[PDB]
Amino acid sequence: GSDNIISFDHVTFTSPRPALSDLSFAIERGSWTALIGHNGSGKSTVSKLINGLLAPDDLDKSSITVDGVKLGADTVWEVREKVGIVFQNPDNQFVGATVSDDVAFGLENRAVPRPEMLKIVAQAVADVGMADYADSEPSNLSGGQKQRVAIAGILAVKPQVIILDESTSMLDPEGKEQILDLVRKIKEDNNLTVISITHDLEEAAGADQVLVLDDGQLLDQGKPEEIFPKVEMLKRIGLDIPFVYRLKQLLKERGIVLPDEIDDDEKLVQSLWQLNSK
Amino acid sequence: AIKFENVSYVYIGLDQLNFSLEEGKFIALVGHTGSGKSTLMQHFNALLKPTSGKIEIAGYTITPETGNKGLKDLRRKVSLAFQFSEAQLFENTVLKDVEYGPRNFGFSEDEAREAALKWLKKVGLKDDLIEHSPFDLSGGQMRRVALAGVLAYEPEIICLDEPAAGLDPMGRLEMMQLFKDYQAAGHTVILVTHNMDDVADYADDVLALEHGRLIKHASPKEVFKDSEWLQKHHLAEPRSARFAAKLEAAGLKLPGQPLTMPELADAIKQSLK
Amino acid sequence: YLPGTTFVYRVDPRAKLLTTFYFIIMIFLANNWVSYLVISIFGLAYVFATGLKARVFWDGVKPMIWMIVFTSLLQTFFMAGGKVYWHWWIFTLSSEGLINGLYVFIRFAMIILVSTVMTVTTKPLEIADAMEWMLTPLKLFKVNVGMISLVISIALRFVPTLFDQTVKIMNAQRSRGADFNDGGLVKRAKSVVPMLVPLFIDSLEVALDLSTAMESRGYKGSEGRTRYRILEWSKVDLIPVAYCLLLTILMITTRKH
């Protein structure tokens, strides 16, 4: 059905112009939905708005109904339990002394007995892939590794929505693929919805749903193969189409037309091979 | 003509460097994370003087026993742009912050202001945004002013740490285009990026380093000729290169290895013809 | 700091801190020759039990010699008299004050000596939670101790990061063309203070982001927590206790009364 719904909402920071205005959208259950757009004007605030950190300016027209629990000042902590966030900067989010302490921070806050905490933290750290660094200090960890630990902290609590607030912005284009693969495998295994608010459209190219934000208002919602062909809209808004679609555009200008169903390297190599054969 | 002979810094470690970078060309300094890029960063203008060898930079000489007197001329000739410049903003006025660069190298007030306005215009920003406080700048705009303070006094050699770390692709493309245009004027840029696609797109000399030592120094078309070498030395590959490898794994021949997007497009167009 | 295999590194840090406090109170308490020698031999026995090289304590003591020698000289000349070797133009060059002078000296030395081991046997996090355990009886006040312990643990790892950010912005400003260190104290009022604000606001932003992350992970106060990292009393933790007790005897059977 529908897991997370925001409708008829608008937020002003504390303030010369509404950052979010009349935003209305929905999230499918157990699907990868990614928000894209120009920097500011919505991307930076949705994550802190979903779990009741920030608040809508007019609570009368609030409609945040994550998992059927209408968000409000009374029931913030239930949403906090049901939604986890991986923030942008990894250095100033690694709370706790070391790994196996950061990952168990949520369990420590939930007041569960220590042996179960040890079991769960060990299993989660093994699942993420930080088994060999189970007791390393944060200084020794190098960049993307830290993010992995953060994901473990989200994974131990058993959430239902994981929001990546530009979690892969400050990493090299190699570790970003590793973190994307890890997140996809975790989504497949634990069966949890993922909302990836990232400016990098490599993540959006593989997402099940993508939502474009213009100036605080949703502009288009659909599958990546349905929206990215509309290159003029993305260029006017201020976004550059991803690798496979940019290549398709280059071949289209080069004098050869390709079907619009192609979405990634697979079936594109097939289309080119068949075209050469035919 | 940057020239390093027997350069080695001790006490991150750098040992036994020997190379020569020419003038009027792009330079990309690629290396593994924490494998010596940051140490070689600060030797270009004697932040960290070498413990051996000699450095020749635009007629200036750097030796281990050289003192701190007269280094302002070298820092004029060679400038650095450190990573995450959003934290180095200093003055109260954006114009004052940008003109703070030339004010330390004998530039008069009128010419300092003229250079500051010219370089804000070249970086673009906005014409009406030159008076607000730098702290009031919104995100990426805060980056665009900072580079101006480094690029105000037309340094002969400019050395850049990752400038596009955390920028949208359009902003990164515009920034790289500006840097290439500046290089086209006769200067040299020494750009450091983990992002390999930028190196493949805009470079002429590639300096592949790892483990605190220099390994390869050659044009980008030559450093990517052996994928086994790249895998062995933990160095990434261009996205177009990976696409070419995947396409070749399907049995389709490509006339020459392409690096940039138009090169791959032309190569596959020739292959189908 | 320095690791090793000596049995001292095995005992509870809380026991280490309690024994250190008791030892500092005893050294502040002993005020005669016999008790001074008792505390001296106990401290040197503790040092030899640690098994560390004498240079490890000597180099740590070296930077703190100015204050101890100045205090010793000031208190010696405040009451010295008696024998005189030579007479200068002003100073009488008294000598009997030594009857306690160097005594006070060695006192501070032992103090630093104990402090020395306290900073070489345990990593700072252990000292932090030992401090939390020692201040636990403060819970009768309205102020809580768990939040203080958590923020101390956070600061003990952000402070090196803050200093690294400071040296980074120093290098950036120097590369831009600024001059800081050789401009004299007169130029420091135009170099460091106007640079101070951006690093402070960056640190404030880092703290705000950390607070946001902690509150978004479910930090419902600091009263219902269940600590993950725990330290338990061992049987070996008895060796510093009886030791302490022995000193108590050798402090009550020889006190000046």
Numbering used by the authors:
A (entry chain A): 1 to 14, 18 to 281
B (entry chain B): 2 to 12, 21 to 282
C (entry chain C): 9 to 265
What's the publication's text?
Energy-coupling factor (ECF)-type transporters mediate the import of micronutrients, such as folate, cobalamin and pantothenate, in the majority of prokaryotes. A tripartite ATP-hydrolysing motor (ECF module), composed of a membrane-embedded scaffold protein (EcfT) and two cytosolic nucleotide-binding proteins or ATPase subunits (often hetero-dimeric - EcfA and EcfA’), forms a functional core complex with a membrane-embedded substrate-translocating protein (S-component). Structural and biophysical analyses of ECF transporter complexes from three different organisms, with different substrate specificities, and from different laboratories revealed that the core complex and minimal functional unit exists in a 1:1:1:1 subunit stoichiometry. Based on these fragmented structural insights, a model for the transport mechanism has been proposed in which a substrate-free solitary S-component with an outward-facing binding site topples within the membrane upon substrate acquisition, associates with the ECF module, and exposes the binding site to the cytosol, thereby moving the substrate across the membrane.
The main difference is that transmembrane helix 3 and the regions close to the extracellular side of the EcfT subunit in the solitary ECF module are less well resolved. Notably, in the solitary ECF module, the docking site for the S-component remained structurally intact and unaltered compared to the docking site in the ECF-FolT2 complex. Yet, in contrast to the full complex, it is accessible to the lipid nanodisc environment. Moreover, the docking site is hydrophobic, and, therefore, compatible to interact with the surrounding environment of the lipid nanodisc. In the ATPase open conformation, the lipid nanodisc has a dramatically increased thickness around the empty docking site. The observed thickness of ~50 Å in this area is needed to avoid the exposure of the hydrophobic docking site to the aqueous environment. Moreover, the imposed tension by the convex shape of the coupling helices in the closed conformation may not be energetically favourable and was captured due to the mutations introduced. Thus, the solitary ECF module in the open conformation likely represents an energetically more favourable post-ATP-hydrolysis and relaxed state.
